[PDB]
Design a protein around this motif. Structure first.
Motif, PDB file in Angstrom:
ATOM      1  N   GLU A 168      -8.890   3.764  12.021  1.00 26.83           N
ATOM      2  CA  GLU A 168      -7.436   3.616  12.620  1.00 26.83           C
ATOM      3  C   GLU A 168      -6.657   2.354  12.668  1.00 26.83           C
ATOM      4  O   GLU A 168      -5.576   2.701  12.607  1.00 26.83           O
ATOM      5  N   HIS A 169      -7.170   1.173  12.559  1.00 32.56           N
ATOM      6  CA  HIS A 169      -6.211   0.173  11.588  1.00 32.56           C
ATOM      7  C   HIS A 169      -5.100   0.575  11.058  1.00 32.56           C
ATOM      8  O   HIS A 169      -4.301   0.462  10.582  1.00 32.56           O
ATOM      9  N   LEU A 170      -5.732   0.871   9.878  1.00 37.88           N
ATOM     10  CA  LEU A 170      -5.217   1.424   8.342  1.00 37.88           C
ATOM     11  C   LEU A 170      -4.191   2.532   8.749  1.00 37.88           C
ATOM     12  O   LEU A 170      -3.343   3.011   8.336  1.00 37.88           O
TER      13      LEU A 170
ATOM     14  N   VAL B 193     -13.067  -5.143   5.344  1.00 33.27           N
ATOM     15  CA  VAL B 193     -11.305  -6.039   5.851  1.00 33.27           C
ATOM     16  C   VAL B 193     -10.539  -4.832   5.840  1.00 33.27           C
ATOM     17  O   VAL B 193      -9.946  -4.077   5.098  1.00 33.27           O
ATOM     18  N   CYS B 194      -9.192  -5.537   5.713  1.00 36.86           N
ATOM     19  CA  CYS B 194      -7.862  -5.141   5.725  1.00 36.86           C
ATOM     20  C   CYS B 194      -7.153  -5.612   4.382  1.00 36.86           C
ATOM     21  O   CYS B 194      -8.276  -6.300   3.501  1.00 36.86           O
ATOM     22  N   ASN B 195      -6.192  -4.742   3.686  1.00 33.76           N
ATOM     23  CA  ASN B 195      -5.603  -5.065   2.303  1.00 33.76           C
ATOM     24  C   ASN B 195      -4.826  -5.602   2.572  1.00 33.76           C
ATOM     25  O   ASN B 195      -3.627  -5.834   1.490  1.00 33.76           O
ATOM     26  N   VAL B 196      -4.060  -4.798   3.928  1.00 33.68           N
ATOM     27  CA  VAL B 196      -1.852  -5.348   3.975  1.00 33.68           C
ATOM     28  C   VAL B 196      -2.234  -6.801   4.455  1.00 33.68           C
ATOM     29  O   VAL B 196      -1.854  -7.679   4.148  1.00 33.68           O
ATOM     30  N   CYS B 197      -2.878  -6.478   6.187  1.00 36.79           N
ATOM     31  CA  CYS B 197      -2.838  -8.151   6.785  1.00 36.79           C
ATOM     32  C   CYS B 197      -4.216  -8.793   7.122  1.00 36.79           C
ATOM     33  O   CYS B 197      -4.442  -9.655   7.521  1.00 36.79           O
ATOM     34  N   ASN B 198      -5.100  -7.908   6.125  1.00 36.99           N
ATOM     35  CA  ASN B 198      -6.158  -8.979   5.589  1.00 36.99           C
ATOM     36  C   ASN B 198      -6.875  -8.494   6.941  1.00 36.99           C
ATOM     37  O   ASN B 198      -8.026 -10.123   6.510  1.00 36.99           O
ATOM     38  N   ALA B 199      -6.972  -8.555   7.922  1.00 39.73           N
ATOM     39  CA  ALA B 199      -7.446  -8.156   9.248  1.00 39.73           C
ATOM     40  C   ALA B 199      -9.634  -8.109   8.802  1.00 39.73           C
ATOM     41  O   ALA B 199      -9.376  -7.118   7.904  1.00 39.73           O
TER      42      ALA B 199
ATOM     43  N   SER C 133      -2.229   3.293  12.087  1.00 45.18           N
ATOM     44  CA  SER C 133      -2.376   2.023  12.629  1.00 45.18           C
ATOM     45  C   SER C 133      -0.925   1.634  12.793  1.00 45.18           C
ATOM     46  O   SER C 133       0.399   1.443  13.215  1.00 45.18           O
ATOM     47  N   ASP C 134      -1.305   0.422  11.460  1.00 49.26           N
ATOM     48  CA  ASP C 134      -0.398  -0.975  11.871  1.00 49.26           C
ATOM     49  C   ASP C 134       0.545  -1.086  10.717  1.00 49.26           C
ATOM     50  O   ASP C 134       1.756  -0.773  11.013  1.00 49.26           O
ATOM     51  N   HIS C 135      -0.102  -0.387   9.927  1.00 46.25           N
ATOM     52  CA  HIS C 135       0.190  -0.422   8.469  1.00 46.25           C
ATOM     53  C   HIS C 135       1.121   0.317   7.678  1.00 46.25           C
ATOM     54  O   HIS C 135       1.938   1.214   6.949  1.00 46.25           O
ATOM     55  N   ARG C 136       1.051   1.671   9.141  1.00 47.00           N
ATOM     56  CA  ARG C 136       1.508   3.045   8.985  1.00 47.00           C
ATOM     57  C   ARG C 136       3.085   3.059   8.784  1.00 47.00           C
ATOM     58  O   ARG C 136       3.977   1.941   8.929  1.00 47.00           O
TER      59      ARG C 136
HETATM   60 ZN   LIG Z   1      -4.304  -4.674   8.145  1.00 41.15          ZN
END
Ligand SMILES: [Zn+2]
Ligand SMILES: [Zn+2]
Lengths: 50, 49, 97, 60, 60, 37
Positions: free
Chosen positions: D19-21, D3-9, D23-26
């Protein structure tokens, strides 16, 4: 249209290599003291969905 | 080190420098796994780093 | 000044274990601190490179020597903060000590 | 699952999360347009002039 | 137990995991994995070795 | 989210040091108060 496109891509001697363009571009010398480098911008323009 | 959590044993050469340099190199290789794993395991910290 | 001569200003030294190897040329022209086609422009050291590049090269070669297997080319790819911010903080620390 | 910690996907593998970490919340791409010595000045300018913000077409 | 942080498979031993990494993910480039890259570098090392003797063979 | 991530030194220290020293050195030349005068 997709059908024909895939058929075309299936049989074709042509090969698309993105590296050749970057190599031709990046190797251009420039001063590092300018606040804007056109090289970085043009790379940033065509890089997305590479 | 012989094996870090999440890595594979025997990937670090003996020529690894002592002191801060050795630490930095180890962390640099270990960076991504730590960041991702920390996100899953722990709540986020309170303000950006 | 030589690469090691200037890099020692922040206690970045050569390990004794390396004293039996010909590390000179590698540090000179194999640890790219700024490869044009790879580095993000944010990491461009600009004018301070005269004393920034040796530090980055020392860090790069240290990481390369860390891993097992054959020696590979080392490249700085990105600094999270701007290279300017890194240089500024370093100057502060240099002034502090 | 991871899981993520920002959008929590959530992600089926740790690699996909990484890779999501990255790319998205960068940071945004627009930050790379100019030097930090200018970007800070730009940010200060926009913050200073926020009082000129156009009102929504509901209060009017 | 151990997880292959790319394909998310689980393994009972580090040996089994390592063999899977060498075999399955032989050409992947995920930063979470190191060993395939080193093996790839070794392959490059050998190719250079060919370049040496190809212009300098060995006589009896 | 951000608290102090924009904080660095934001001017050339050499100029400011030269300026600061200069003003301090000539600080003795300053004016008298009307009470003192
Ligand atoms: Zn996220
Ligand atoms: Zn796997």
């Amino acid at each position: 249209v997709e059908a024909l496109s895939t058929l075309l891509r299936s049989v074709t001697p042509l090969v698309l290599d993105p590296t050749v363009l970057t190599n031709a571009i990046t190797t251009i010398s420039e001063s590092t003291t300018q606040t804007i480098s056109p090289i970085s911008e043009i790379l940033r323009l065509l890089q997305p969905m590479g | 080190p012989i094996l870090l959590p999440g890595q594979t044993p025997f990937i670090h050469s003996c020529y690894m420098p002592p002191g801060d340099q050795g630490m930095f190199s180890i962390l640099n290789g270990w960076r991504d796994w730590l960041i991702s794993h920390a996100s899953t395991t722990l709540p986020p910290l309170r303000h950006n780093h | 000044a030589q690469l090691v001569q200037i890099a020692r200003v922040v206690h970045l030294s050569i390990p004794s274990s390396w004293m039996t190897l010909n590390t000179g040329p590698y540090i000179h022209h194999h640890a790219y601190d700024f490869k044009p086609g790879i580095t993000q422009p944010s990491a461009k050291s600009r004018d301070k490179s005269i004393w920034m590049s040796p530090i980055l090269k020392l860090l790069c070669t240290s990481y390369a020597m860390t891993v097992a297997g054959p020696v590979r080319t080392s490249i700085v790819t990105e600094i999270d903060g701007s290279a300017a911010a890194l240089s500024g903080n370093l100057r502060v620390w240099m002034r502090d000590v | 699952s991871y899981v993520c910690n920002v959008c929590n996907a959530r992600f089926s593998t740790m690699s996909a999360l990484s890779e999501h970490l990255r790319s998205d919340h960068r940071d945004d791409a627009s930050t790379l347009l100019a030097t930090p010595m200018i970007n800070n000045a730009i940010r200060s300018f926009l913050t200073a002039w926020d009082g000129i913000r156009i009102l929504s077409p509901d209060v009017s």
